[PDB]
RNA sequence: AGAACCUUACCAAAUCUUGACAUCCUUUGACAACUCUAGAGAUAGAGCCUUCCCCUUCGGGGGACAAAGUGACAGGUGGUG
RNA sequence: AAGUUGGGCACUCUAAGUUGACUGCCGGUGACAAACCGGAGGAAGGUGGGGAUGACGUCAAAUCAUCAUGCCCCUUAUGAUUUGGGCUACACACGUGCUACAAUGGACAAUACAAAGGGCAGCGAAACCGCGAGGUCAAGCAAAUCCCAUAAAGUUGUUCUCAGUUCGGAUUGUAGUCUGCAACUCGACUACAUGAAGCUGGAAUCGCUAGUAAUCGUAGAUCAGCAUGCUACGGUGAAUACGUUC
């Protein structure tokens, strides 16, 4: 979709939302790509065969639409898993004393 | 026992390649975190670039480079209170050997390249040509201990 | 036949191994004598204080001394030491046949 | 210059928590001109006799202990700060004999 | 001719033998450079028969047991040193004065309780 | 908490099957900390005892992903 | 306080998850050894007194 | 300082065990049957000059050896109370076979007796320093070498507890050769508990 | 040297006072030694294995289960190192 | 195929019962006064290394919550009995550790070498079936043999190229794996997602004199389940002590 060039494709598809080290296996399954594909890859006939396998995935941005509403559903029921989002609470039953900083 | 007398200093084992005690002592100081092999391999690939950028064999070049590192005067602090408390004192031959090895490695770790493949060998040829960063702090000690010469 | 000799003390398991190697050679036996198995110790590390203090503790250990006796000439005179129960104080004997 | 206060079977108030820092705190702030330390105040009631106050301030070299066995927990600190201020002057004049005229050969 | 010596260092026993031939070691029935990791300490491992100069004389073919690579090495140079004094028994002073024939002098130190690990006391804040 | 037997309190399922037949009553005093929410629980109102005071709550249809105890708060936080 | 909890233990509970252990003479439950069933206080006591069988003191 | 008890150095080093059995499987439960009959023997005897007991277990014939500084009182009148003991000791466990008793000379040089008989000189509340000195002077008179004993708390009847020890003779507590025997009693005086330690040697 | 329950001593509830424990004990009433129902749940109500061993000759005493009892007593991780 | 099997090779090794290191033995100039200093003699040398052991005493030091008892207090309760909370809460503040902020590294392939300890329905192999956490039975066994268990760092090769990038992985939704009446308060992992602070840290401050600092992984006690803690274990292993004036 908006991937960068001049790097290897096993790390290049990671740059979008929704892919981490599945391009090593799952995108490598459907497409006949290799590991050493730089910017000089000629991935335009290979752009189509990755477009068929990425169309099944929720990855490119649209997963964050469903991820946002899952929190919005969770706070609307007002669950203890959901109040901890709206209140800076670590949510997954953690100790909210001194070393609980990344939620503030 | 540093107040019963002096500690008995112990023997080391010289290198097999250069047949030098001074090489093995350089291996032990670049040995970060007990890893003998992963540091000795780097020194064995940090004098080939020495022997590439100069035709001489590096066992001559090593003991020629450290002579621009090893200082002849340093500062030992004597607790005189309101005085300068910085006495220029010459260097014992054991500390003369060690403190040159210390400056050679501690400024090899602060260069532009990341690999100590060539972090080390660049500073050696600088010390072989009496320049660089580990040479210029010897002159900084020779502008500090040689400025307060009123305590010979 | 593998008569198992294990005990807590070392002076007792050695003198009870001398009993079974003596009361078998008097009979028609061909005794492979006592060879010492390695001791299966176990360390227990309690803490010394009544209430509070770690960083000052007493370690405890208990050691079992294992030996074995085997014979390969079974006569009814050799098993008279097997049926004849002696030194039952602090040694158990796991008699296998 | 914090005050880890804690009372053995006594409920600490907040009128004490301002009376401490004016006398135990401020009169030793101008001593120790490079300060970073923690104080410790014990208040131990004894129903048979009285209370007691223990103030310990550790420093780089020499600590600072004092005790009063009074029952008035406002008048006793008038004597703790007296014993504290005496002990700092012992510490400083120990190390303020740097001024010794020693001419080298 | 099999001059069979033993040798220990740092919780690693090493028994050797001496068949005549030339200098060639077969530690655990394989090559040394494919078993010992980086070939530096092997020329320090050849130090005991260096002073008796029996380089092209003896194949050894060690069976080593336990420890690590600097525990398997520095125990076969002590291994053949007990075997070199039944090859050259009058050359004992050549090995006594220089290194190999001393001992297994020292192993790891006991972890005392109330402490982090092996005489390194843990950090406390208030001095 | 395996696939095998998604857990129900089962001293509460017996008390809710009498409720869903005819017109429902709007209170079940219970504890319900152990049980999950599956679609035979919708509509009904439970007074979940949070340790202090049993709190009423009625079951919606988006509640099926979660379990019954996750709703009545026990912290009494608000504070600062 | 103490012997109510001793009486709670020795009865058979409803659940195998409860499975609760204390000591036979030590009231405390919190330092048991399931080969000895002794608290760390009296196991230190009756091994100094030798009432337990063969257990050395220390210094391996 | 924190002197540990002198028996604990020496159990097996220069001494032996007060229980000399073995059980690999079910070590726990039949260890409890020991201190069942270490409480129970100390219940009905009730200072019948008993120093200490020994337990040995072998093939459901479990032995009990008691020392009994006053011998015959546990026996009774020609095997009366010794048979009256096995009428209850064989019921608290299964077998309890071959109950017996041996005798000891020098009735108050074993330290269990020496601590106990002067701890019972404290309920009558009479002259604790002489209660000390009665034990010291009699000790090497009867054949001992080193004697040492103290009394710790509520000393004399006052409020503040004070230890009070009296000693002479070679008492090598740090030497591992030494056959040091100590004991601790629980003398109550109806104003707390007095604690009393002793130390005998040879 | 192992806080989901237990631990747990804390709190909110539901209900107990010879007390879930121990001891004299009296009639030793001699197992409510097991399932259904009602229940946050202990508990409550019924269905119930009415006994257990010896040794007399009569049906007692010893181990017999505790339904009731108090002269009593118990129980307190309540307090003050 | 390693059955380490046949024989027993018992030899070495290992595993356990005992012989030996003390200034015994010399030389100093060193005068006898013991030591010290330098040798040789054994494998070991100067209380060999380490552990255990902590004098008289100090601190009304710490526990009437391991226990035990003087005094005081409680007795329809300050004792009981249950499931349900809580001990896990948080704008914060100091202790102690873990993992890091990398190309003496990171990711993937190969390939080695340990010690200690556990296994009373417990350890559970080799096979399978799962991406994996793991499920199904038998193989062995109450154990120098059977299992936990292929230690890891290393070494060898291919890689990224010096950026908050293939550095790490905190935090949130998807697997419902397993233990357990039951994981919402309040567990343990792995699965694809998401990827935050963080570029070696100020004043200050702590540990450490050789198999020690440093690092790497493995065990056990608790325990149905659960440690970055604790206690033991080995692997690799520096630097530095001129000196007593502060």
| Residue-number span of the structural domain to which G26 is assigned | 2-60
**CA nearest to B14 within chain E:** E44
CA–CA dist E75, E73 (Å, integer): 5
**CA distances from residue H16 to C14, G55, H65 in whole angstroms, order as listed:** 16, 11, 14
Closest CA to B70 of B122, B20, B142, B13: B142
Distances (CA, A) of G22 to C46, C47, C59, E79: 16, 18, 22, 55
Handedness of CA E47, E48, E54, E60 (dihedral sign): negative
> What is the rounded CA–CA span in Å between residue E85 and residue E48?
11
d(CA B100, CA B102): 5
3-class secondary structure, E63: strand
Please report residues of C whose CB lies closer than 8 A to that of E113. Answer: 45, 57, 59
Partner B contacted by D102 (CB < 8 A)? yes
Q: Experimental technique used?
A: cryo-EM
> Three-state DSSP class for B76?
strand
Cα H146-H148-H151 angle, rounded to 5 deg: 165
Closest CA to A87 of A67, A65, A71, A64: A71
Tokens 């008989």 map to which residue?
A: H117
In whole angstroms, how large is the CA radius of gyration of chain G?
A: 14
Residue F35 CB lies within 7 Å of the nucleic strand I: no
Look-up of token digits 């040697």: H201
**What DSSP designation does G32 have?**
-
d(CA B83, CA B123): 38
Helix, strand or coil, per DSSP, at residue E64: strand
Strand J contacts (CB < 7 A) among A residues 4-43?
7-8, 10-11, 14-22, 36
Chain H nearest C-alpha distance from G32 (Å): 12
For residue B111, how many other CB atoms are within 10 A of its CB? Answer: 17
Rounded CA separation D24/D66 (Å): 11
What tokens were used for A66?
Answer: 């469903």
**Cα(H8)–Cα(C79) distance, integer angstroms:** 42
Chains in touch with E (≥3 Cβ pairs < 8 A)? B, C, D
How many Å lie between the alpha carbon of B35 and the closest alpha carbon of chain E?
12
Q: Is residue A37 within 8 Å of A9, Cβ to Cβ? A: yes
Instruction: Report how far apart the first and last C-alpha atoms of chain C are (Å, whole number).
Output: 5
Among the listed residues F7, F13, F4, F45, the one whose alpha carbon sits nearest the alpha carbon of residue F26? F45
Give strand J nucleotides closer than 7 A to any protein Cβ. 11-17, 37, 40-45, 48-58, 60, 62-63, 65-71, 79-86, 88-97, 102-105, 112-115, 117-120, 142-144, 151-156, 159-162, 165-166, 170-174, 176-187, 192-196, 203-215, 221-224, 230-246
Domain boundary assignment for chain F: 6-77
Enter the resolution in angstroms: 2.9
In chain G the first and final C-alpha atoms are separated, in Å, by 41
- The two structure tokens encoding residue A13: 């598809």
Q: Please check if G39 is assigned to a binding site.
A: yes
Q: What gap in Å lies between CA H6 and CA G54, rounded to an integer?
A: 18
Query: What is the enclosing helix (H) or strand (E) of A86?
Result: helix A80-86
Q: Which residues of E touch C48 (CB under 8 A)?
A: none
Name the 3-class secondary structure at C86: coil
Please answer yes or no on whether G52 and H19 come within 8 Å at the CB atom: yes
3-state helix, strand, coil in chain D (%, to 5): 30, 25, 45
Residue owning tokens 């070393």: A99
Q: Are strands D64-68 and D51-57 parallel, antiparallel or unpaired?
A: antiparallel
Compute, in degrees rounded to 10, the torsion defined by CA atoms A51, A55, A57, A61.
90
The DSSP-derived string for chain F is: --SSS----SSSHHHHTTTTTSSPPS-EEE--SS-B--GGGTT-EEEEE-SSSEEEEE--TTGGGSBGGGSS--------
Contacts of C44 (CB under 8 A, 6+ apart): C59, C60, C61, C62, G33, G43, G55
DSSP characters over B94-122: HHHHHHHHHHHHHTTTSSSSS-HHHHHHH
How many domains is chain G partitioned into structurally?
Answer: 1
Answer for the pair A17, A59: CB distance below 8 angstroms, yes or no. yes
With b for 16 or more beta-carbon neighbours within 10 A and e for fewer, the B28-61 pattern comes to: eebeeeeebeebbebbbebbebbeeebeeebbeb
Identify the residue whose tokens are 């079992």.
Answer: C64
Strand I and G14 CB separated by under 7 Å: yes
Q: What is the dihedral of CA D71, D73, D75, D81, to 10 degrees?
A: 120
Dihedral, H95, H97, H99, H100 alpha carbons, nearest 10 = -170
Distances (CA, A) of F73 to B16, C75, F46, G40: 72, 80, 14, 40
Q: Any bridge partners for residue D8, and if so which?
A: D44
Instruction: Report the SS3 class of residue G15.
Output: coil
- The DSSP secondary-structure symbol of H87 reads H
Beta strands in C15-94 (DSSP E): 32-36, 42-47, 57-62, 65-70, 91-94
């Amino acid at each position: 979709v908006d991937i960068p060039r001049e790097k290897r494709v096993v790390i290049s598809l990671t740059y979008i939302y929704g892919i981490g080290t599945s391009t090593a296996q799952k995108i490598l399954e459907e497409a006949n790509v290799s590991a050493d594909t730089r910017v000089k890859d000629l991935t335009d006939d290979e752009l189509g065969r990755i477009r068929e396998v990425v169309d099944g995935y929720k990855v490119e941005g649209d997963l964050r639409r469903e991820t946002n509403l899952n929190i919005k559903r969770l706070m609307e029921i007002s669950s203890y898993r959901g109040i901890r989002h709206r209140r800076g609470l670590p949510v997954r039953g953690q100790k909210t004393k001194n070393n609980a900083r990344t939620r503030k | 026992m540093p107040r019963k007398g002096s500690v008995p200093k112990r023997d080391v084992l010289p290198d097999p390649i250069h047949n030098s005690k001074l090489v093995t002592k350089l291996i032990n100081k670049i040995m970060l975190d007990g890893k003998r092999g992963t540091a000795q391999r780097i020194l064995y690939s940090a004098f080939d670039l020495v022997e590439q950028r100069s035709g001489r064999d590096a066992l001559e070049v090593f003991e020629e480079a450290i002579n621009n590192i090893m200082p002849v005067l340093e500062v030992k602090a004597r607790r005189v209170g309101g005085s300068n408390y910085q006495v220029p004192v010459e260097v014992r031959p054991e500390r003369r050997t060690t403190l040159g090895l210390r400056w050679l490695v501690n400024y090899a770790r602060l260069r532009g390249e990341k690999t100590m493949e060539d972090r080390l060998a660049n500073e050696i040829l600088d010390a072989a040509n009496n320049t660089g960063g580990a040479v210029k702090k010897r002159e900084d000690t020779h502008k500090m201990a040689e400025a307060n010469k009123a305590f010979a | 036949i593998r008569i198992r000799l294990k005990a807590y003390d070392h002076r007792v398991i050695d003198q009870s191994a001398e009993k079974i190697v003596e009361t078998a050679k008097r009979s028609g036996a061909d005794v492979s004598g006592p060879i010492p198995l390695p001791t299966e110790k176990s360390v227990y590390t309690i803490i010394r204080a009544v209430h509070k203090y770690k960083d000052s503790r007493e370690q405890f250990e208990q050691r079992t001394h294992k030996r074995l006796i085997d014979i390969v000439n079974p006569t009814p005179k050799t098993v008279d030491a097997l049926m004849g129960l002696n030194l039952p104080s602090g040694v158990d004997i796991e008699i296998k046949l | 210059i914090r005050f880890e206060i804690h009372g053995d079977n006594l409920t600490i108030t907040d009128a004490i928590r301002n009376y401490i820092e004016e006398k135990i705190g401020k009169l030793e702030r101008y001593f120790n001109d490079v300060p970073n330390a923690v104080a410790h105040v014990k208040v131990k009631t004894y129903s048979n006799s009285a209370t007691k106050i223990e103030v310990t301030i550790p420093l780089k070299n020499v600590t600072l202990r004092a005790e009063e066995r009074n029952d008035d927990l406002y008048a006793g600190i008038d004597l703790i700060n007296n014993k504290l201020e005496r002990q700092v002057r012992k510490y400083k004049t120990r190390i303020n004999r740097k001024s010794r005229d020693r001419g080298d050969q | 001719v099999e001059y069979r010596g033993t040798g220990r260092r740092k919780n690693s026993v090493a028994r050797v033998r001496l068949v005549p031939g030339e200098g060639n070691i077969t530690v655990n029935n394989r090559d040394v450079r494919e078993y010992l990791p980086f070939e530096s300490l092997i020329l320090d491992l050849n130090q005991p028969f260096d002073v008796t100069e029996t380089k092209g004389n003896y194949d050894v073919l060690v069976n080593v047991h336990g420890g690590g690579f600097t525990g398997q090495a520095q125990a076969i140079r002590h291994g053949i040193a007990r075997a070199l004094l039944e090859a050259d028994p009058e050359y004992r002073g050549s090995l006594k004065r220089a290194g190999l024939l001393t001992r297994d002098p020292r192993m790891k130190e006991r972890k005392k309780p109330g402490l982090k690990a092996a005489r390194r006391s843990p950090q406390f804040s208030k001095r | 908490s395996i696939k095998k037997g998604p857990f129900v309190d089962e001293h509460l399922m017996k008390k809710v099957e009498a409720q869903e037949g005819s017109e429902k009553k709007q209170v079940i005093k219970t504890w319900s900390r152990r049980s999950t929410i599956f679609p035979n629980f919708i509509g009904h109102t439970f007074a979940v005892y949070d340790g202090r005071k049993h709190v009423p709550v009625y079951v919606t249809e988006d509640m099926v992903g979660h379990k019954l105890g996750e709703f009545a708060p026990t912290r009494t936080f608000k504070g600062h | 306080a103490k012997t109510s909890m001793v009486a709670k233990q020795q009865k058979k509970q409803k659940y195998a998850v409860r499975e609760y252990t204390r000591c036979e003479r030590c009231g405390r439950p919190h330092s048991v050894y399931r080969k000895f069933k002794l608290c760390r206080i009296c196991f230190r006591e009756l091994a100094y007194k030798g009432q337990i069988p063969g257990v050395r003191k220390a210094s391996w | 300082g924190q002197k540990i008890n002198p028996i604990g150095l020496r159990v097996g080093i220069i001494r032996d065990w007060e229980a000399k059995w073995y059980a690999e499987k079910d070590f726990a439960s039949l260890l409890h049957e020991d201190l069942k009959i270490r409480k129970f023997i100390d219940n009905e005897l009730k200072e019948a000059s008993v120093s200490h007991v020994e337990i040995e277990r072998a093939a459901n014939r479990i032995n009990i050896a008691i020392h009994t500084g006053k011998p015959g009182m546990v026996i009774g009148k020609g095997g009366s109370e010794i048979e009256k003991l096995r009428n209850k000791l064989n019921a608290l466990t299964d077998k309890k076979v071959h109950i017996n008793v041996i005798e000891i000379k020098k009735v108050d040089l074993d330290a269990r007796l020496v601590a106990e008989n002067i701890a019972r000189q404290l309920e009558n509340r009479a002259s604790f320093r002489r209660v000390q000195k009665q034990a010291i002077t009699r000790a090497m008179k009867l054949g001992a070498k080193g004697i040492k004993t103290q009394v710790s708390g509520r000393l004399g009847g006052a409020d503040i507890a004070r230890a009070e020890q009296y000693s002479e003779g070679t008492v090598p507590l740090h030497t591992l050769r030494a056959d040091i025997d100590y004991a601790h009693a629980e003398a109550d005086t109806t104003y707390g508990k007095l604690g009393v330690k002793v130390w005998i040697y040879r």
